[model samples]
Target: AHMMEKLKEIEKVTKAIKEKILNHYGYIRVITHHDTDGLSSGGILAKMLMRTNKLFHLTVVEHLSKEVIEKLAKENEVNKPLFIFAAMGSGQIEEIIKHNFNAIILDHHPPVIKDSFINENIIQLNPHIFGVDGSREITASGVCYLVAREFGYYDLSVLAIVGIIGDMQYNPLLGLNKFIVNEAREYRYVKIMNDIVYNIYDVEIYKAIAYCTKPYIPDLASEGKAFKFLKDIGIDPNKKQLDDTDKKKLLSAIIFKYPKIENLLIDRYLIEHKVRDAFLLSEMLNAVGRNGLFAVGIGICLEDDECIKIGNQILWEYKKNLINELKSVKLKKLNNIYYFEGKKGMIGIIASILVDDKPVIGYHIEGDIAKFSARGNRDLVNRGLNLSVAMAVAKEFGGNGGGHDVASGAVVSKDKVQEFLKRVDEIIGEQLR
Candidate 1:
């Protein structure tokens, strides 16, 4: 309830500082995370600035590396650039907060709060500071949307909604996220296919049972119990609309396949109600960003026709490659965590895909470093999984990582990866226990 009040406080302060940008700066520079939520955050800010006839530079970075920081500092010294960092920039030192120019950081990631990181010119808006869970309630784009709303521009709510969903903020979408979803629906920005019990578009009943990864059934499969269920229920793969009796039968069959698969019946939102042409446009952006085509996701957010088309193609291609990889990765199971080796840029995808029986830790070599991506489902989080904490424990071993409770990522020395994983697994277990 007080979440809105906190956001209003952020909005008032940001606007006062925001108004100064138009007068003192020649351009607005946006720095953001390179994932779908990140790119979407940048895209929303990009269009908002563009509409004002303000020239802006948008840069996406995987991390706030020294080289990138140096470049940003240099640019700030030169042009005194008005900078907006989206989806990233939560855990920075005072040196990073040293720019003389007016700056705004809109991020949902956990921040390393310091008294030194604040000043009159720097506006930091994160849900964590206001007692709201950034991991689930407010995404970076949702933060930007509040700022955008202060400026009286409500047209960008759809893109903001994408960021919310992109970060998997669909746990009844509480706090700011729920407000956005409700406003978006009331404004007719999104439509729900309440009739759907599963993925409204693209997914078939047979595939639904086989592909429901949260409760990964190594025993049951697409051709095994799933296909048998379809035959038993007299369900058709191509059929989108089923009678109520059929729905009941299908639900029973799915539960039989995996008793814990509770979401056999759920509402599906169309991507434009269908963004990238899938029912969940956010997932498409997530894939594109993870595929190193984050810029394409940005273009889609900006409403570029070509970006939308190309994004769709890239998403499917990425999905095809991911599906094959998911089919082949060899997993090693620990107590409450499953881990595996994966290629770069694909570890997170693999971790998320196989995030069923336990929280997953996926790693791959990247030069001198070994990167790990961790993910968990809502149930795991509810049962006391905090991936950000798990990954943060890896940092004590000279590694670096932090993310939401349901999903996180980390990196360490190539040689130290196993120890990092072991400690993280222990930490995750301890958190749950």
Candidate 2:
């Protein structure tokens, strides 16, 4: 019943937003993050506005900074565009409000502002505001979809599915995500297939096991070994679809190798696209975004054939980079965490893949700034982990950071990198204690 009321709140908020959007007569400006969820949000908003005959321009950004907001404000000095920030405005709501621009923030991140700043012009639609678990449930794309749905844009639900899968939030699809999935089913926007989570990769069983860097199976590091492991266990390595018995056999071996594995059975979405597998599409979007091709990722969400072709090539390159980096990653264990220095763009991916019982931090030095990415598992979060809070320690050292409890990042001076990490370790230790 609590969850049902939350859904009602979401619907009420989105209806108000829909009215606001319909009343706007000026150009619609969308600023969003460059990740899968952000791109998916941007795509849905763009399509929704297009169908409504609203002129729109979408900007894919890495972060929402004061400078970015100021620049947009200057551009809107005369007649302001209806600024819609997707996936990335909650954390910087104060900055947007300070500029006096008419804006709508559709994000999942926790808001950081005082009560005095809540005004009529800039509205925020974040799951965190409604006592919802935004991090593990619905994300920016899902938030954007609810608003789009108010306008009868049910076809856009598939993009929301892509966003949900991209954010890794569909391990049972709880919260608002569950609502989105249910609606998608009713609208026939997606079909679900029950399978072992391994089938989500959309590859041969052997290739799936060999490329399983999420858990980093040491025994299946090589393709030959992955194939042999399957054969030795009486499972078919070449099988594209695994039966219940084969699924059990493969999952048992994997769990034995990494007991931390969770959610073995999953519901994989099949969408109407060239890349029908929603999880594979999510990965391709990530590849496009991480490679600085935000438009390509958005195009994929918008169902652009050319973009899908380019995305496949980009995904190949990304996997090569990820595999190469994972093979050589050397972790330096601290009292409370494990960390490594690597490519700035790859830090987040590496940190997530390397995370085990202890939290993981990845850093890279570029110019005088050292960028940090951290990841912690659900267990650590349940045990009181908050990477976002830990990463905020960077601000004490002339830097800044904040994200989710399970994953976060920061940027600090190269000279302060060691101290920043030490403080983070201490903070994690405190949280664990």
Candidate 3:
């Protein structure tokens, strides 16, 4: 009964937002995140708006800032753009509501709310606002799916699945996301295969192990150790159907590093495009976005053939760079955070893998400015570590950033780096204690 009430409230907000969107007789601009969930949400919204006979402009952003806000306002004034933000902006609402720009936000992040943090011109549809859990109940693209369905474009439901899975909201899929997945299954856009976990793609098991980085085993991943492991187990490295004996040895080897890899029922959702599974497609988009190939990722979502080929190549290149980044961390481990100097594109993924005991913070410095990526783990989040809050508070140091609870980022003044770190640590300590 509670879940149904949440749904009704979401639908009520969705319709109000949708009405405002369609009533606007102006240009449309979608400023979205440069991640898998962001790209999927943008693509889904783009496809749905096309039916209204409007040509909208789409901009992909890694984060929001005063400059971005000014640009959005300028675009709104000059082009009369109806600004739509996806998978982001919830954490930036305090700054955003100050601007008084007409905008619609489709996001899933836990918001920064004050008692009177209301906007007449801006409509936000996030799960947390309606007493629904943002982490598992729904996603940004799932919110887009709701608006698209109300617009009578049902086929776009598939992208919601892709975006939700891309954001790691897979297990049991709650709230509107679960209902959207059921609808997608009815439309034949999803096929769930039971009880299979492949850390690598569908290829030779040896090569699969070579590319596996789920746990990022120091000596094995990106090394030739996989070849010897198979040889010692009396298994050929060639492509062959793995029988029970082969499966047992493979599981044993995988469990050595990723202990949860054994007998855990995993489901693969087969999706469209040249990608095999929805999860794989999300990875491809993630790679392209991280490598700064925004167009390539968006193109894949739009089903462009050349974009698909280029996207695949970019994915591997990004993966290889991640492996390279892994080998040379160049980090200084502090009591509460692991700080590193790395490329802007590689930090989020690298920090994610390296983040275990503490939050990993990576920054790329050029001149006097720095682009910093902050990532936490589920354990830290459960312990009351909200990187979004940390980054938002860091805004006092003159930078802007926002994203999810476990994964968030910011760009700040190089001079304020120390202050930012100190404040983040203080915040984490206070909340955890």
Candidate 4:
């Protein structure tokens, strides 16, 4: 009954937002993240607009920053009377809302500012507003799904499931996505089964690696050629079982030689415990998204194309560098958290890699401010230990910070790193306790 009531309320808000969009007959601009979830959300929205014979401009960014805001503003200047569909839960990009435009933010990340002052032109439908954890109610993709449904396109929910998987939402234990997953099963959009988890078969292996490569090349040899290659190498695809020596060689070549950081060991452990290969593949894909090359990560969702080939090459290069980096990583323990600084832009990937055991926290010193990134374990929901709240406290100490619950980042003064760490530790500890 309570869930039904909440759904009704969501319906009311969805109606209001749809009315706002329909009433304006202006150009729509969609700004989203570059990952699979972002792509799925943007694709849902774009497809919906197309169905209605409406034209909308789309932009995919790696991350939201001040520069992105300025670029959007410049574009909007030429195309006035615009409607902006910003991704949800990105506090950093909310600063861009200060400009004059009709904006609807669909996100699940923590908010840096109060919801009340998000500008008159902005209609922020944040789940966090209703005392529900944003991370749980809906990811940015889920939010986009809701908007699409409201706009009369109900077929896009399948893509929402894909986004949930891409974001690793169904890790150890499912969160709000559990509801959506059940719904997908009812609609026959997906199939679920209990089985042993482990590495992909040879065919899937080629596809997965092809997904990592770029366009213009087929990473997976043709069926005839595949057989020839295997024959040349003295192996048979038809034989599901292999001799002990050959099995050891294949396992060592794939699992050990190309071991990804996130949950590689855990999946192997699960396989030892008799988990299914399908389950193992799911876990491995999550690891790829968390720590593998971004292009390959995104290509996993795309069809066989030149883009997939390009992504494969990028993935190979990225994997080589990541392995070397991991070998030299010096784990730093600090007040209830684990951390290690790496090359710039690798903080989130690093946190994702380490969070299987426990939440991982990282910091990168930039000028007078130190940037932070935090990620929680699969079992951890990232609720109580709110990074936004921590950032709020840090701001009180003359720093600027805010982010989502499961994964968040912050910026603090370099001189106040110790103080910031102490206060953040206390707050996080209290929240977890």
Model number with the top lDDT:
2
Give the candidates in order of lDDT, highest first: 2, 3, 1, 4
Clashing pairs in 1: 197-266, 270-273, 270-274, 271-274, 271-275, 272-275
Q: Model 1: residues >4 Å from true position, as ranges?
A: 1-4, 21-25, 113-117, 193-198, 202-232, 240-246, 270-279, 334-337, 365-433
Q: Write down the lDDT of every candidate, Cα atoms only.
A: 0.71, 0.84, 0.76, 0.57
Best-fitting candidate, measured by TM-score?
Answer: 2
Model 1 accuracy (lDDT, Cα) = 0.71
Write candidate 2's Cα lDDT for 1-433 as tens digits. 7667776777877887888888999878899888888888988998999888898888988867888888888978777889999988888877777788888888887777523126888778887777777878898889999899889998888889999988888875788888888888888878988777668666688877677665677667667988999999998888877888997777787787778656556677988667888888888898899889988887887788999999988986787667778988888998999999998677888889888889999999999999899999888999999999999988899999998899998999999888888899999999999
RMSD of 4: 9.1
TM-score of each prediction: 0.80, 0.85, 0.77, 0.63
In candidate 2, stretches whose alpha carbon ends up further than 4 angstroms from where it belongs are 2-4, 113-120, 234-236, 261-264, 334-336, 365-372, 382-405, 408-433
Question: Against the true structure, candidate 4 has what lDDT?
Answer: 0.57
State which candidate, 1 or 3, has the greater lDDT. 3
> For model 4, what is the alpha-carbon lDDT of residue 63?
70
Least well predicted 10-residue stretch by lDDT in candidate 1: 270-279
lDDT of 2: 0.84
